[PDB]
Paper text:
We previously demonstrated that MilA, a CMP hydroxymethylase in the mildiomycin biosynthetic gene cluster in Streptomyces rimofaciens ZJU5119, can convert CMP to hmCMP12. MilA and CH are akin to the superfamily of thymidylate synthases (TS), which transfers a methyl group from CH2THF to dUMP to form dTMP in the de novo thymidylate synthesis pathway and, hence, DNA synthesis. In this study, we demonstrated that MilA has a substrate preference for CMP (kcat/KM = 39.2 mM−1 min−1) over dCMP (kcat/KM = 7.84 mM−1 min−1), and thus offers an opportunity to investigate the mechanism by which conserved TS evolves the preference for ribosyl over 2′-deoxyribosyl groups. In the structures of apo MilA and its complexes with various substrates, MilA are all homodimers.
Subsequently, the structures of MilA‒CMP, MilA‒dCMP and MilA‒hmCMP complexes were refined to 1.65 Å, 2.10 Å and 1.80 Å resolution, respectively. Through a comparison of the active site structures of the TS-dUMP, CH‒dCMP, MilA-dCMP and MilA‒CMP complexes, it was found that the 3′-hydroxyl groups of the sugar moiety of substrates adopt two different conformations when complexed with MilA or TS/CH; the 3′-carbon together with its 3′-OH of deoxyribose motif has a dramatic torsion (with 3′-C set as the vertex, the angle from 6′-O to 3′-O is increased from 102.3°/105.3° to 136.4°) in MilA-dCMP relative to TS-dUMP/CH-dCMP. However, in MilA-dCMP, the 3′-hydroxyl group of dCMP forms one hydrogen bond with the Lys-133′ and another intramolecular hydrogen bond with the phosphate group. The main reason for this difference is that Ala176 in MilA is replaced by a serine, Ser167/Ser169, in TS/CH. In contrast, Ala176, with its much smaller side-chain methyl group, is the corresponding residue for TS-Ser167/CH-Ser169 in MilA and makes the larger room. Therefore, both CMP and dCMP are able to fit into the substrate-binding pocket of MilA. Hence, MilA can not only can utilize CMP, but also can use dCMP as its substrate like CH and TS. The KM for CMP was 0.0719 mM, 3.4-fold lower than that for dCMP (KM = 0.245 mM), demonstrating that CMP was a better substrate than dCMP for MilA. By contrast, its counterpart residue in MilA is lysine 133′, which formed hydrogen bonds with 3′-hydroxyl group of dCMP or CMP in respective protein/substrate complex (panel 2&3).
Residue numbers in the entry:
A (entry chain A): 5 to 231, 240 to 329
B (entry chain B): 5 to 231, 239 to 329
Amino acid sequence: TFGTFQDAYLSQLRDIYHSPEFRNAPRGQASRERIGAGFRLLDPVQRHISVPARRANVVFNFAEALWYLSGSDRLDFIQYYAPGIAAYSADGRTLRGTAYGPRIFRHPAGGVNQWENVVKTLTDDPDSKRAVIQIFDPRELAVADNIDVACTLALQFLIRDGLLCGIGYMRANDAFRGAVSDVFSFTFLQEFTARYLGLGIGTYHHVVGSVHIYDSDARWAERVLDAPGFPAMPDGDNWPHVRRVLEWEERLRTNAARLSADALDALDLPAYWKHVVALFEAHRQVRHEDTPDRALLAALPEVYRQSLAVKWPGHFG
Amino acid sequence: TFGTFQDAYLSQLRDIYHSPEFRNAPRGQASRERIGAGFRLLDPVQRHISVPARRANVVFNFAEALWYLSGSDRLDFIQYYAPGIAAYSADGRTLRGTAYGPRIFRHPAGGVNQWENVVKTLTDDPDSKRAVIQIFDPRELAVADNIDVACTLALQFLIRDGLLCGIGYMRANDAFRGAVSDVFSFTFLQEFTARYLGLGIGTYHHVVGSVHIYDSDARWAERVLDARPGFPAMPDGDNWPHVRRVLEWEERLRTNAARLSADALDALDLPAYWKHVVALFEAHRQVRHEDTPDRALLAALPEVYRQSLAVKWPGHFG
Ligand SMILES: Nc1ccn([C@H]2C[C@H](O)[C@@H](COP(=O)(O)O)O2)c(=O)n1
Ligand SMILES: Nc1ccn([C@H]2C[C@H](O)[C@@H](COP(=O)(O)O)O2)c(=O)n1
């Protein structure tokens, strides 16, 4: 049990690095590995890694979480924030097991919007043990040479003593890279759903079949091992805000618009979501080679400024 | 970490009974509960509960595991061994979330035989992290007033250092009743799959979202807490031919379309391990169809099974 994700993350990284249960090479990928490993977080809103050597990218973090909320499988959205993700796209335009959005809101087993059913299940029966969003699908194993099979099995939500608890079940998790964004996204969905339900935040449990560090990540992982609060999302239904943020996300990503510090403050959005749009504008400055905006940076929560300053030190450091 | 399931079971039962995190009533069923709980078994073949006060039913245990291997959703098969299971059948003929058989071998998502795909996945890539049997289905929460929603999410198998390890992921588990037969069946499937693959047995990991004791079981649960012969190993190799023959006898004995004396059972053309399983079904047929109990049958069984039968049906085998 850990207070914040960062303590859990580093503890697990050290466990696998120094006392791996196995060294093997699934699909030819040499790894250190522990089996059946997990942790409990007391404060899931504190979901970020702030160790500078890790260079956690808070823009990618929100982009991935919002890509899920959009229900999209499209590669162009997410590859803008992480170009290497295209290696898991077989068709050059969509992702499969990596795209949790359609698994959540239109799962290929029946076209089901599972988030809606979870919300209704917990409204009719607050004590329910059934409020599960399934991610994995039985047909992913049916064809050989699938380059992108979902590694998350399911996400569960439970209301306990007025608080929404979350549990993520995964068959496998890259403990150095994937875990950072997976825990971010799952606790983001937990918090988003809690706000929608009008509840506080309970614990988050992460449970993983194979948790591993790729040998190709060892040097960076060693660097990380040798080495301010995350803001709370506003109460209530955040779907209207998410829709407006996604409109700005696409306009900024394609460089079809840009937002000054004053334009960002004038957005018709809660402050929390204004900061997310500001992160997309900062990212647009990087990607499309526009002037880094000192005023934008100064108005962000300190957690976000630090992430930006360490990730792109030439722009925001 | 525990050596055998019985140690894990009693430890967990004590945890939930004396130190529950929550007390609540999902779907109106008052319960003691802990969230996010599990254990590891170093020797999953030792999968049985022998505490006499528990009255663990080894006939049901094998029946449920073999019901799964048969791929069946039929209620008549399984309610014969556990009459109360009929409470979860909406149509009086089939089970839904309780019937893991069809989930394993012809899952509602595409009719996929996932056991074959897992075996093929692990044959092409022994180190695979993808060898998962999905149980739960997204449409189950869309059924209004669904009385039988799968509580197992998935089962995973991994070949690690020549041993087949298994992991059961559940969203919820009844720690008094369901855990006994779920861990039995899952470790049974693990061993069965390990024999087929020519591997030894590794650890079994059980991970559960809501682990709970229903208030209506509290009295029985403390009797168990207030209170060995070893479980036999399944034979090496592909056990599907034996399973097919055992399922033929299971159906004839359950419908009283056949019966076998102790000497007839000993002479069956089956490995000893499976002959004992057929003998358990013949003994159960003697109970449920009111035939003469065969004490000679009882004497030839492994002691673990003898104890189970003697405690469960003392008038017949006690
Ligand atoms: N959201 C994601 C997507 C992928 N992975 C990592 C863990 C998997 O082990 C690996 C995919 O390889 P495989 O399918 O062989 O497990 O990617 C992860 O940790 N989180
Ligand atoms: N193979 C099974 C089937 C059912 N259950 C128990 C756990 C569930 O919590 C409960 C079903 O109720 P619910 O759907 O509300 O969780 O039955 C179990 O432990 N193992």
